[PDB]
Structure formats: structure tokens, C-alpha cells
Amino acid sequence: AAASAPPAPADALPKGADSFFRTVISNMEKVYLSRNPTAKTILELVRSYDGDHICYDHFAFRTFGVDGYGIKSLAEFFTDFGYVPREELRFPAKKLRALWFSPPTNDGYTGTGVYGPLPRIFISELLVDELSPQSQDIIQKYIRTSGKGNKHATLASTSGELTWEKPIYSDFQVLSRESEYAAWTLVNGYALNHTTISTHRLISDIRSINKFNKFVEDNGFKLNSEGGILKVSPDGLLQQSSTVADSALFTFADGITESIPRSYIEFAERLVLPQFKDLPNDEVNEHHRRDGFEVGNADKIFESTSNDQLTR
Ligand SMILES: O=C(O)CCCC(=O)C(=O)O
Ligand code: NI
């Protein structure tokens, strides 16, 4: 038989870097919770129902793929803190590309949320050069107003700031008609687009995602309907659901106040891999479960912020 070996575990961070990294993602989460009452409420409801067991499966971010404002503007922060780039996903109809990142080894975490197992990171970018000339010019205008803001995307994310000037409503309107993703990013920037609860790490009966979905719906919240409320990967091992994004009033730079999408929250179940079929269920750890993401699922979860879902 050919020589075989297990995968090399990723390096762990030194103690200061690990601590510091967690204060940063904690600040990203603070902005997110302050602007997304639905996500904040659901996280409180799960904690009360299940106990202190909430783990974050992944964080997701959106970006403009032009002039260095894209995936790389955030990825460098995470790779400075030991994250490893993984698979690239393509979304041709929506004109998006995404990369996900797996965390450094962190087996000694002592808490939950950002103090629990470190989350994967999912970062997408809009392929701006594929849009109409008019939208390319609108995006380029804001990118010019931002200067070297792209070199400090994490500062922007931790503080809840846009690096470009505040948009005028007319520009938001034009982008909304061609790319809802572009419109989302114009008004939200590098803000955390969602966190994800790892349901299989819960202890109570809502650890099953079908039970979890009914728990959310019975507390009055609406799940993303597109492609069904439960997106199931073709191998059956990655099952995902998400809320409809919250909305907020935004005063645009020309004085007009209008509704915009903020963020949402996702729930994900990763099932055991087939080679570990007969593992006793008390023996399953995260590395025994389906890792990564699935283009089919992701394509429909992007629509949690779409106007059709928000106006259902
Ligand atoms: O809406 C976004 O920005 C990311 C949607 C994709 C995703 O997070 C997943 O596949 O779980
Ligand atoms: Ni997600």
C-alpha cells in the first residue's frame, strides 16, 4: 500500500495573538448585534433554551472585487492570525467569487461564541468588471472616495464604519436594480454579514436542524424561503438555514431616508462523514463532520438579504 499520513494540523497561535484575535472578532460581533435585533434575540433564545453551548460555525463578509477592495482586503487579517485559505466557490449568475478560511488549531478554548471554537471565515467579492458600465462607474466613484481604506478593512469592520463616503439614494437605487449584493455592500461595507450557529454542538433537541428551524419559526421569526427553508448539500452532509435579514432606516447623503438591508443569522448542521459512519455518536468531533461549504446551498443563502425575501 502507498505511504499515507494524516493531515497536518494547522499551527496554533501564540497566546497573545490568540487572545487579541478574539477581542477583534468580539468587536465585529458587537456591531452586528447592535444593528440586528433578530440575530441578537435568537442568540438569547437559544442560550436560554439550550444552555451555554453556542458555537459559531462561520462568519461571512461581502466585498467589492475591484482596486484591492475584495477578498484580499480582509483575508490578510485572518491569515495574519493563522487562518488557512481553502476552496474557491464561484457564483456566475450573481457575478460573485468566494473563498473560505479554516482557523488555526485552538483546542484549549474556554468559552462560547467568539471565546469558543474559532469560526471558519467565508469571504465573497462582487466581480465588478462584469456589471454594466453605469454600475461600474458608481462603484468606482465610492472606491475613489475611500482612498486606502481597503488597507484597514478590519478596523472598518470592528467599528461599524464605511470607508467610502455615505451613499446617495439614487446610486443605491441603480445598484439595487442590477445587483442586490452590490447595494448591500454599498451601505454595509465590511460589516459582518452573518454569524452561524453550529446546531450539532447544541445539547438539547434543537441540535437537530429541523427541530431548530421549528423552534425559530415558533418564536415568530421568518426563515429564508428560497430553495426551501433547509438547504441540503448533494452529499446530504451539510444542511443550512438562515433568517430573513433585518431592515433598518438609513439616511443617505442627499437627505433621503429609506429602508436598507442589514444582516441575518444562519444555522448549520454538519453530519458525520461516511468513513466514520459507525462511530458511536458520543465519539464524533468536528473533524469527523463534513467540512467546508457547498455552491448550491450558498447560492440561495445569499438571498437572505434580497428584497424578495425581506418583503415576503
Ligand atoms: O450572504 C453571504 O454573504 C454568504 C452566503 C454564503 C454562506 O455564508 C454559506 O454558504 O453558508
Ligand atoms: Ni453562511
Numbering used by the authors: 3 to 314
Per the authors:
Soluble variants of plant proteins were constructed by removing the predicted N-terminal localization peptide. As expected, the E. coli homolog YdcJ and the plant homologs AT1G07040 and FLO7 catalyzed the conversion of 2OA to that was confirmed by in vitro assays analyzed using high resolution LC-MS. In addition, the FLO7 homolog displayed kinetic parameters similar to HglS, with a Km of 0.55 mM and a Vmax of 0.89 mM/min/µM enzyme. In addition, the structural conservation between bacterial and eukaryotic DUF1338 proteins was compared by obtaining a crystal structure of FLO7. Initial crystallization screens resulted in crystals that were soaked with 2OA, producing diffraction data used to solve the substrate-bound crystal structure at 1.85 Å resolution. The FLO7 crystal structure, like the other DUF1338 proteins, displayed the conserved central VOC fold containing the active site and metal-binding center. Comparison of the HglS and FLO7 structures revealed that orientation of the metal-coordinating residues and 2OA in both structures were nearly identical even though the proteins display low (~15%) sequence identity. In addition, the FLO7 structure also contains a substrate-binding arginine, Arg64, located in nearly the same position as Arg74 of HglS. However, unlike Val402 and Ser403 of HglS, FLO7 does not possess any other residues interacting with the substrate. The results of our biochemical and structural studies of FLO7 manifest the remarkable conservation of the fold, active site architecture, and mechanism among DUF1338 proteins across different domains of life.
